[PDB]
Amino acid sequence: SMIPALRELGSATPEEYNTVVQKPRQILCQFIDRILTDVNVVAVELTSVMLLDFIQHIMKSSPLMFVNKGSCIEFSNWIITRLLRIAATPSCHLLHKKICEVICSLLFLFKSKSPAIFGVLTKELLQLFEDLVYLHRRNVMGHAVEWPVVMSRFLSQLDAPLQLMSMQNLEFIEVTLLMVLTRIIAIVFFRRQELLLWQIGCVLLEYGSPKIKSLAISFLTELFQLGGLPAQPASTFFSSFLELLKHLVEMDTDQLKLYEEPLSKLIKTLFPFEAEAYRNIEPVYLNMLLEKLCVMFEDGVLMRLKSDLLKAALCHLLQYFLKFVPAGYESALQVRKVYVRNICKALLDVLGIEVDAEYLLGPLYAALKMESMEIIEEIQCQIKHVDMNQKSILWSALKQKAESLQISLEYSGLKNPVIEMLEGIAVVLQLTALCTVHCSHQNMSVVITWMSLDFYTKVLKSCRSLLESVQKLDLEATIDKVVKIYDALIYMQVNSSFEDHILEDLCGMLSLPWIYSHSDDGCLKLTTFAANLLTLSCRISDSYSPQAQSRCVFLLTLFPRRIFLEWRTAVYNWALQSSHEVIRASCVSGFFILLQQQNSCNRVPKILIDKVKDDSDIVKKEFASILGQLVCTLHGMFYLTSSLTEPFSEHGHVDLFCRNLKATSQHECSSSQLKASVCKPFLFLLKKKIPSPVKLAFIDNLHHLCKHLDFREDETDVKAVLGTLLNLMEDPDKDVRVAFSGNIKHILESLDSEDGFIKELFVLRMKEAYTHAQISRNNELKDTLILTTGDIGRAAKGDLVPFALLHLLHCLLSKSASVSGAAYTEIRAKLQSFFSQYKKPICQFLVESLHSS
Amino acid sequence: ASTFFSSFLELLKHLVEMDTDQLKLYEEPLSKLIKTLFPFEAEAYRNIEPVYLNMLLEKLCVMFEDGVLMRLKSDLLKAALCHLLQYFLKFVPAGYESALQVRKVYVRNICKALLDVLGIEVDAEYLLGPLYAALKMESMEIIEEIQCHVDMNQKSILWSALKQKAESLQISLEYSGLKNPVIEMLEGIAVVLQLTALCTVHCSHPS
Amino acid sequence: GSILINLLLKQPLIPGSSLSLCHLLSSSSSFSLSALREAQNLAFTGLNLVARNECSRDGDPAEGGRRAFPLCQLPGAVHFLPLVQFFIGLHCQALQDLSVCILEGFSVTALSILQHLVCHSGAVVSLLLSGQGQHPLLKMLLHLLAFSSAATGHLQASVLTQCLKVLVKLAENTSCDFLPRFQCVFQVLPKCLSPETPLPSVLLAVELLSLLADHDQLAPQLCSHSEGCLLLLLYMYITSRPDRVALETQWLQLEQEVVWLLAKLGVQSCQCNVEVVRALTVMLHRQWLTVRRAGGPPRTDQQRRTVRCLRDTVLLLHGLSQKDKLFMMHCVEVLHQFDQVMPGVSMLIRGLPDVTDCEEAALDDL
Hints:
Chain A: HEAT repeats lie at residues 715-751. Chain A has 853 residues and is mainly alpha-helical. Chain A contains 39 helices and two strands. Chain C has helices at residues 4-9, 22-25, 36-52, 81-94, 100-120, 123-129, 136-150, 158-173, 189-193, 199-213, 233-239, 248-268, 273-294, 301-322, 327-331, 335-351, 357-365. In chain C, helix 3 runs antiparallel to helix 4 (81-94) and helix 13 packs across helix 16 (335-351).
């Protein structure tokens, strides 16, 4: 209030500052003395907010009002207590957050200036919280509460004391201080302190409302993320955790709204897919956990629960226990075999009743694939052909289950819930494909049987009819289903193509939408299926969904053969101008190869290079991402194949699992000798203004791209291209700049030799860069450039390392922003002998600077 | 068994809380059971899985350290417990129930509790047998150890403790005399002397 | 809790040697076998005793007070030791003598046992920390520890780690007052920190240096004596890798532990004040050099540990700057790295959404 003297602490000494500011502290307390002396002083109806806002503002602005002696200490303790009494009232809830911010940021300030005071304050706060949780225990423990209480900490003799009369008070104060702790964890974290935090978290969790339990769950997550859990705390935590999991299915929706996110966060962070995360855990705990997982599963939980998310956490945990935890840690092996067997029986039992069964995919595939590997291995003892049906009970059970579903649907669409059943068949097919491909160590000498081609034909009959008479109501979901099905089918047939007719037939349903309504051309004339499917096409084409449409288009683009190829290419071009940017992305990501199948293995499509030249930058992002192997497409016949493309490394919400392939030359992938005349149609993407994401994706593709393209050939156009490229380094985007810095390594790994002209353009463009930098004074750009040069040098071989070294050495003669201190040491990857290598040029690097003296 | 022993031990622990009439109910049949299940006759323990007896002795040391010996009312039940302790000392060996050291711990603690009661009760007879048994066991083990003159009081903490307690009661008389309880203190002194005599005579056997 | 049984019966106590407790008891081949059998009998007796554990149920009211996270009193455990100390002696008796390759294995196993015990029991802790007349086990460890470190025996790689896990768990499960019993550690921590030691050992020694630094009379035992000083060893180490396996993740664990140590020491209230900042800068430049290039949001756990370390180091350095205003002078040698990092790390932390008024204030101060 006495703003002038408040600001001008003035003559107030380090010893008298305390007293000079005692009066300001008195004024602030007078403020707090009344507006917040008691809880219901006002109908909260929520002006007082301005008071806490001023507390926070003056905290941020003038530290001396609080700190700089013991008076300052009890002052806060006096203040804090005036707040805690507010954090206990329900009606005051809408301030409790402002209190989570007032208490917070204040411990912060104290940390910034007077750590020791912060440490002692934290110790009092923690002794307080400990008393509170022990009281919670004693309360639900069935012992005395004596609700009239003191909770005597932060004790201030300055001159109301603290008391929680109802579990409203205790729960509220606890949740508030708990949020504060979730903020200040790191500042408070220490060795012996961590066990205390663990103890109070476990107290809350074993005993507390569900809300406080979720809060403490997030808290414990941050704790395990900061310092891991020791043994002393575990047992309690795990008992609580498992009892909670068991209680889940017997839990309410809102209750689920509480436990939903933090529980999944905790489980993912405490049971992560990255291996060696189990060593932190005492096996006994994990065996108990697996027992309770089997129990939850064996109890029909998955149909009983509601949150599709939480089921995702469960499936993730199961995937962990399947693959990343090695048998021999959780328990002996047979116990694990038995458990997983039973849980998989259940995971099977569920599928026909859910609409989205994907989360069942990771673990089901994981078990199928584990057994496949162990089987091909034990029999790798002695080609070696094998059959799968009679091998694993899970496999043939899944098989006959898919059969039961296909059939019960075959009897009537009405007697069957179409979507869940089509989904069951589709997931079984997805698993058949994923496993027949990757499980087959031949792809990694053994071969293995899988689901039946007659069954494939059966379902191919069934799907159209289910659609053909779905009453036009649920059709759309069925389009999505058939999309997924055909996707699995097509991944499979790519691994091993089938008899033509089955492949011929398929091409119809994939082309279904755009056959009837508008084709009316000769492609459908010479096409067989079209005349057969005219009626269903006129029934359906208008119903196809844009996402699903682009899906089908990408699928057809995947459809490889000298089979209706003209028609596939026709529809690909048609959709190339489809008015649907999703469809345009699919169009590019499929034509990139659909054309190399067509003819003219010479250069890129003019049609595409123009279409891409237009807007919908996402199209150009994927355009570069696909260019990455369009280069090799205009090379040896593209030998389509998949990466491991397994589901977990991807987000799992996979649309068209087939959308993971990136092909290669059929054989003899000679030096592409790419004259770069095609890169010009491509590099135009790098106009220095396109969305940085596309430029970054192209910088990424540069890795694969380097080897193919040739550089000595046509020095002129190649050098123009390289200049277009080095237009990157001065790009205003930053991540693109650093990525180009890192990939100049790949480039100069491709370069045949260190010609002079290339070193010449290097020096020219880097001088241009440093000049634009200092003329602009863009230190960020200076750092990007120093890193680009450091990479070019650490990778360069000949006279170039000398040049980048000259540049770094000149940079060493500059102001704070001299990253060289890092680089010119990195180049060692013998400072004295290395100087000797260029001692003579090195000294020259000095002379010009010495022209200053 | 396990079920029966859980019930039995929980019942024992609850005893001191039992009231006069409910006590009356449990009084005779419980002593009868425990005598028919824990008799001095040797080899009657082989029927019993040792862990059961260890759990029993645990709850027994607990009840005794729980102040029962002087709280409880039924002389029948205090006699039964004394009989059980006398069984765990004499009729049963060591090694079957458990290792020795923990056995010594228990018996020493219960003997301390028993030393705690002398001046209180008027009839301490039931208190006698178990003590004499422990003291004979010690005296024997001690002379055999020496056989690899000797005194007692210093050897066993329990002996010296007992003699000190007797002296304490004698002085308590000397100072306040008659107002001090003229009875059951004499009984404590007289049992101290009874044991002095018995274990001077029998525990006898220059060294 | 009761899980002590499961822990003791864990099939491989250490990965390798396939030696469980059973493989310790059933060995008819210091005590002279006049106590081997007796101790084995104590062992299985205590096994039964704990397999009962009526205690740690329905709350165990007695559980509470000091001994942060009160360790559930498992009195049966108290009976295991005479065995364990028999073997720790046959390690000691076999030591102090100018083969042992076998006996030392039983000793490692028994040390793992004692580790689990001290982890989940409180009566054993009261005993050991009690009687100076230290329970023979404590001395059996300490007279070994020097031999655990001074001698780079092929097996001295492990016995040390286990004795350290034991000492540290015992300092954790216990209270603050008894630590003056731990006082004996300081005569041996230096050898425990020699550059000939591997990452996991120095790590435990740091954790324990902290657990002692919580004690009033104990902090100076950090660098009461300015020379050698049980520091500048930690820093010469954190800077110049004396280990070769040196799995970067391990070095991150160690940076993190050293940081938490520095922070506790600074807040609780040598020539060494000077080297610390040099080492922190070397460390930090060791971090910022890693994550920057990867950029974007760190989905990697290693990246998250690194970020936590960087934020904590920044706050720590702000406290430093609050002290020893010559910090710029002592920083002169590395001001290059310092100003080649500080701006980028400030940019980063600003990018972080978990920012703190402390982080912002500090990064601005520099």
